[PDB]
Amino acid sequence: QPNDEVVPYSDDTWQVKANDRTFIPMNLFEQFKRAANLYFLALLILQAVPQISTLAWYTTLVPLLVVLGVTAIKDLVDDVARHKMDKEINNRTCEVIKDGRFKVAKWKEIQVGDVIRLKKNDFVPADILLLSSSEPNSLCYVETAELDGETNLKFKMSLEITDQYLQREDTLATFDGFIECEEPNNRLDKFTGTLFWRNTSFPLDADKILLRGCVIRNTDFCHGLVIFAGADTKIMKNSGKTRFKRTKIDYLMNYMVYTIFVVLILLSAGLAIGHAYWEAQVGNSSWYLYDGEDDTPSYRGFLIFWGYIIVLNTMVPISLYVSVEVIRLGQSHFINWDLQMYYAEKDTPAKARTTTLNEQLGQIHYIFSDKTGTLTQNIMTFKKCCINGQIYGDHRDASQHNHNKIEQVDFSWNTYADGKLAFYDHYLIEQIQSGKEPEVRQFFFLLAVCHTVMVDRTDGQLNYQAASPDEGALVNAARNFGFAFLARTQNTITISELGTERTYNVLAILDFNSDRKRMSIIVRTPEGNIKLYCKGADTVIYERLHRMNPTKQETQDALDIFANETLRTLCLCYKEIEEKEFTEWNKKFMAASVASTNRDEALDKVYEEIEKDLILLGATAIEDKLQDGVPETISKLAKADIKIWVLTGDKKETAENIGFACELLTEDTTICYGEDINSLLHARMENQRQESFFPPGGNRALIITGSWLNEILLEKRMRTQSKRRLEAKKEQRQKNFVDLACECSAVICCRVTPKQKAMVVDLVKRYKKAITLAIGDGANDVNMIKTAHIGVGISGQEGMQAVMSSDYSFAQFRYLQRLLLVHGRWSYIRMCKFLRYFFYKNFAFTLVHFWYSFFNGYSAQTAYEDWFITLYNVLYTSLPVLLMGLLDQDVSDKLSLRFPGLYIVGQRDLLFNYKRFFVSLLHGVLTSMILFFIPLGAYLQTVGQDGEAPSDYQSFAVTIASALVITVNFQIGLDTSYWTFVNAFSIFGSIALYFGIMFDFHSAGIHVLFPSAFQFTGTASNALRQPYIWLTIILTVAVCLLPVVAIRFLSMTIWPSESDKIQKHRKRLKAEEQWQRRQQVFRRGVSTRRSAYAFSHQRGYADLISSGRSIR
Amino acid sequence: KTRRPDNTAFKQQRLPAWQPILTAGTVLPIFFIIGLIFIPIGIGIFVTSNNIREIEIDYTGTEPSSPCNKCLSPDVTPCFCTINFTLEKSFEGNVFMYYGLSNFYQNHRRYVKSRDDSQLNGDSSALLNPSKECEPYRRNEDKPIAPCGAIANSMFNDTLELFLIGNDSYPIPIALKKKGIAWWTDKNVKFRNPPGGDNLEERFKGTTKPVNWLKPVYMLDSDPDNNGFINEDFIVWMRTAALPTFRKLYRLIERKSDLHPTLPAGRYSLNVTYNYPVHYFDGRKRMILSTISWMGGKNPFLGIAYIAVGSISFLLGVVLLVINHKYR
Ligand SMILES: CCCCCCCC(=O)OC[C@H](COP(=O)(O)O[C@@H]1[C@H](O)[C@@H](OP(=O)(O)O)[C@H](OP(=O)(O)O)[C@@H](OP(=O)(O)O)[C@H]1O)OC(=O)CCCCCCC
Ligand SMILES: *[C@@H]1O[C@H](CO)[C@@H](O[C@@H]2O[C@H](CO)[C@@H](O[C@@H]3O[C@H](CO)[C@@H](O)[C@H](O)[C@@H]3O)[C@H](O)[C@H]2NC(C)=O)[C@H](O)[C@H]1NC(C)=O
Ligand SMILES: *[C@@H]1O[C@H](CO)[C@@H](O)[C@H](O)[C@H]1NC(C)=O
Ligand SMILES: *[C@@H]1O[C@H](CO)[C@@H](O)[C@H](O)[C@H]1NC(C)=O
Ligand SMILES: [Mg+2]
């Protein structure tokens, strides 16, 4: 029942009249969306209440305004960058009618029902109705490589009435046509409508509708009437819904901000309880601590709880969000700057068009790739051929093999030949030139006749307009080998045989169809003989061969060799037809042609009658050229433990060939189809009415058509509860397939809709909880690009449908190596290094107030100067961690491509867990103990006691702030592995900036201006002049960092990471052999193990030549 | 799309960088030079601090048999407490006299902020309009308190005197210097008298004294350079202590002209006018005499800490060395 040849759009009125057509909201956006921004607005209120305030309002506005200002600045450049992205690439213009004549118009100046005009190689701006075209009968050939993966051309026809009345420009303007049709739908395979014009009703079908993703090919100009436009086009209806993408760590940081909030409430409540107790047996007896306020001890503890919320508020960071997005913004610019991801051929650099999803590039689990245009160049070339059992195509010279290094064959002896055919084999040439083996000549005569392509000679260049690239590849190849298809007529062809102008009479073209898997042509030679020429699949043709076929075995061996080389193979054959035999068949053939009741099946029946005894000529081999480095990229990302799935709208045969060419499917893999997959899933149902679907050691792959994908996924009061089983039954089936598909080395989904592509991506996100990357080109990949965690749009081409909806955009698939292994892998290390240290330096700084609480009566007296808390998070500790998050490198970029195994670190979320989070909080907790209790030990005794003795709170505060700044800036130097000059400058500049500003605040000049704000006048000069103060600062820093160095060394010595191992033997690594294809896997024992047949083509072309529709 | 990126080290992300690796030969040296540099410093601090000559007398007299418990309940507010202490070893060079208070939370937040710096800076406006922070001690009856604040109000107002009991048994007075006991910045920058006039009487017009103070701030001292907001004892107190247990410089006992020790070993008597009550909140008043050391003062904690940290660094180095050798 499921059909492997069609895309299942089914399992997923409108009226058209012709020619009758910036700072206020951003601050609010970052306030509400972020809980921390409202937290710091709440603290401002608590800081303005004199009953509870323990820190000046300066302490929070100054960090907050800087944080708010920097976020606004970043949001501005993103707004400007996005505008530049849209404007500079949406420069698409189409000719429209709005006055007496056509005139250039933008794609956005297109209304529903305005006559337009397109030229050769023009993308269709909107779903239109063919009104007229240059070639006869108002035909139009369009390639839908962007609407689906199909690489062949499809012809479209206009109404017989619009063709003969809207040819001229003048009448197109006056065309007042009324169209009723369905409302905008997503289903691209038919169109229900009617055209009311000239007091008559003309029904419409999809054969008259050009869709937006189409590209006009082989048509000088075509005029259409826009039916739908913009988001109403059937391709945009297939585009998913844009969602706000967030990283796996974005969600994590929210949980951690809530954890520090809970800790802050609990610490404040305990300290508030302690103060309530302290005020009972100590504070109330202290006459000097009399404030004339009849406050009960429990009221003072309640009243100081808000004091410790304010004092300990710096526990939750005020610069976490700016720091994270400033780091991602810089990391996103390294992608835009990478010259190793710059495609010079199309002048296309990589584009990080979302500056917010960066560390997720280092966590990808599954890649869902498009085929047509993403893994391929959309180029097919004739490579090899077997003739009489002799394979031609190997590097050969003269009449015997001499050397591998062979120069390109010289086609100068051929008049029509050009350089398009890069053939390295001279032995074949003597066979063609010598003529001692006429069957070699007959082999290439077939390729010049058995096609159905068209020829353009409007200026003498003999251009071939092939609807099938396979035919274009073969017809071009035969043209170079001396057999050129020159001219075509309804009844005759004018092939030139090595310069001999011979005109043959075509008696019948047995058209091609998917289930037929072959096409034939019957021609009458100039002598008068009738010959039938057939090319097609090896399986079908070998069922219709003559009994006496000596070359049958040798040709079969060549097909296996071509199949093992990942080439698309066809078998050639012919037979002799007697005059009496043909006229008997011709009489039946004509009857099946005129008989329109069952023409499709009537013609097929008579086709089988004449294709009975065929003599085998040989076989061809065609390469569908991949993009460079595609097999190399797939092998390396497999070493990174990334699974690559191919989701394409192209046929099953093309998808399987590219799977073999990409090395995704090898001769070891056993290929399972929808028939096989469905049976396994069923057996799992009755079995349960989890065991692995396959033995663990086997190698397997799934090639699944869209019809079978719906079949296996069940996507082809009483009502209420009845749905739960239907939904629950599907959900069990959805999970069983994902477990099955993820048990396979490779999975290929072919003939799938844009919705199905996103569906497959979404199933893996749901049932595997995996991070997914989707890469593709054209509008049929927009749905999964928007669905995936990361969406990459292959740029550099002429259609930018998938680029606009993508997170990232580079031209070549092979650049996925550096996007993940270099940029994403580092971005994850750098993001996690930043978070590991960022929460360290905020706990080490804030927990000092907690330890000082046990010596100041739990009174929320700050252990620092008021202005040190103001500038700590923006000046003294901001820059160094930003530079590490933008410059750190554990290994080289070249050494991180050589070892894709380093990528697995971020897939498993090993560098930043909830455990790594609490270990950095314990690191900050223990640092704050030493940062306080070492100075406390010194200050409990004599610390430079003379007239200028710094034994006071202010000197105590300056000492702890000095040791803290040195310690947290020396920790970031222990964390840094890539010590740049800017990294060194920031670490020592931050320490130098603290001392420079502190001495400026603790100065006579500023105190005179306003004594109230600055209370620490002269403290730094006195405190930092004492040897004990510096001996205390040095001891504190040493005790804070020495245990860290020992732990880092012991951890690196006993449990070295993969980066550590590579760095140790970095200078002793020299063996890096380049990737190589499996050159030979030939074997003996099976005549045929796999059919490498592939042919992209459609019905209806033979009927165009048979009649005069396509003949001008 | 756009043109080719420009090949710069930063943008191509290949800046000249030093790649430090925590190798066996890069971290072990720092665990030994630290160990070999911290140990001698700890010995130097420890031995030097022990060589400092110090005596500490607790004259709070909270526990009976101390001969001035009579001042815990001073029926007559002039209460004089006398304690005899003996210096077994003479004090050489300049000697510093301190008073210490324990369990005196001078770092309490409600206490630390109870001052008007603009007033103590000699601002005319702040003299007659004390800030709200010194709220309980802004105004006494109608006019504002000159040193407003819980800090100025709770000023240490004990008087300490030292006499040398000679062989004749006649107490010889010991000269005590009350000048140069505060920070120079505190004396000459932070604390200023209100402007204008030449007599402090008119300058501090229309202000009351702190309620706890016996006499106004006019005559904190007879010296015109040591009275007002620029009084040394007042400024020493105003500098709040970091921890509840602290000591504040009281007097300087300058080195004698003769070669004899400034405080020769013998019998001494401490005559203190008991004025400051601290026994309510379990406080302890003390008198400390300490000699000057060119390594600051007496800090045996830093000496021991350097020995401990230095010893552990050497111990860690050996442990790290063994671990590395096994995993070489
Ligand atoms: C000296 C005895 C250590 C006492 C702490 C007990 C040990 C402790 O809980 O953790 C030490 C904390 C955490 O601070 P650290 O970040 O320095 O500790 C981690 C360190 O980064 C390791 O190396 P690295 O991977 O980061 O390069 C890491 O290895 P790995 O990732 O392979 O596991 C390991 O993670 P793990 O624990 O296995 O999850 C931790 O030990 O702080 C310190 O480094 C020293 C803090 C003490 C500093 C003041 C001295 C009291
Ligand atoms: C030394 O300082 C202490 C306090 O540090 C002074 O004791 C305090 O004296 C004031 C009066 O000057 C007392 O304030 C009020 O006195 C009224 C009498 O008008 C009295 O009825 C109230 O009890 C009220 O407190 C204050 O209570 C008292 N404080 C203590 C702890 O005793 C002392 O007078 C000062 N002595 C010298 C010589 O400066
Ligand atoms: C202290 O000395 C004085 C006078 O020298 C004497 O009257 C008193 O009894 C002495 N007290 C003690 C405890 O020695
Ligand atoms: C102690 O000092 C006071 C005041 O200076 C004085 O009156 C007294 O005579 C001195 N000697 C004592 C109390 O033995
Ligand atoms: Mg594509």
Residue numbers in the entry:
A (entry chain A): 16 to 27, 63 to 71, 106 to 773, 787 to 813, 833 to 1228
B (entry chain B): 24 to 351
Paper text:
Lipid flippases actively transport lipids from the exoplasmic leaflet to the cytosolic leaflet of cellular membranes thereby creating and maintaining an asymmetric lipid distribution between the two leaflets. Most eukaryotic lipid flippases belong to the P4-ATPases subfamily of the P-type ATPase superfamily (with the sole known exception of ABCA4). The P-type ATPases share a common architecture with three cytosolic domains that are involved in the autocatalyzed ATP hydrolysis: the nucleotide-binding (N) domain binds ATP, the phosphorylation (P) domain contains a conserved aspartate residue, which is phosphorylated during the transport cycle, and the actuator (A) domain contains a conserved glutamate, which is responsible for the subsequent dephosphorylation of the phosphoenzyme intermediate, that enables the protein to return to its initial state5. Here, we present a total of nine cryo-electron microscopy structures of the human flippase ATP8B1-CDC50A complex at 2.4 to 3.1 Å overall resolution, along with functional and computational studies, addressing the autophosphorylation steps from ATP, substrate recognition and occlusion, as well as a phosphoinositide binding site.
Here, we collected cryo-EM data of the full-length ATP8B1-CDC50A complex preincubated with ATP and the activating lipid PI(3,4,5)P3. Upon data processing two different conformations were observed. In this conformation, TM1 and TM2 are tightly packed to the rest of the transmembrane helix bundle, thus masking the substrate recognition PISL motif of TM4 and closing the exoplasmic lipid entry. C-terminal autoregulation locks the A-domain thereby restricting TM1-2 movements required for the opening of the outward-oriented lipid entry pathway. To identify the phosphoinositide binding site in ATP8B1 we therefore determined the cryo-EM structures of the two full-length E2Pautoinhibited states and the E2Pactive state in the presence of PI(3,4,5)P3, for which ATP8B1 has a higher apparent affinity. For the three structures, a lipid density could be observed in a positively charged cavity formed by TM5, TM7, TM8, and TM10, similar to the PI(4)P and PI(3,5)P2 binding pockets of Drs2p and ATP13A2, respectively. The observed density is weaker compared to the surrounding protein, potentially indicating partial occupancy of the phosphoinositide binding site and/or flexibility of the ligand. In our experimental conditions (4 °C in LMNG/CHS/PI(3,4,5)P3 mixed micelles), the closed conformation seems to be favored, but the equilibrium could be poised toward the open conformation in a native membrane. Thus, our data indicate that the E2Pautoinhibited state of ATP8B1 explores both open and closed conformations, but only the open state can initiate lipid binding.
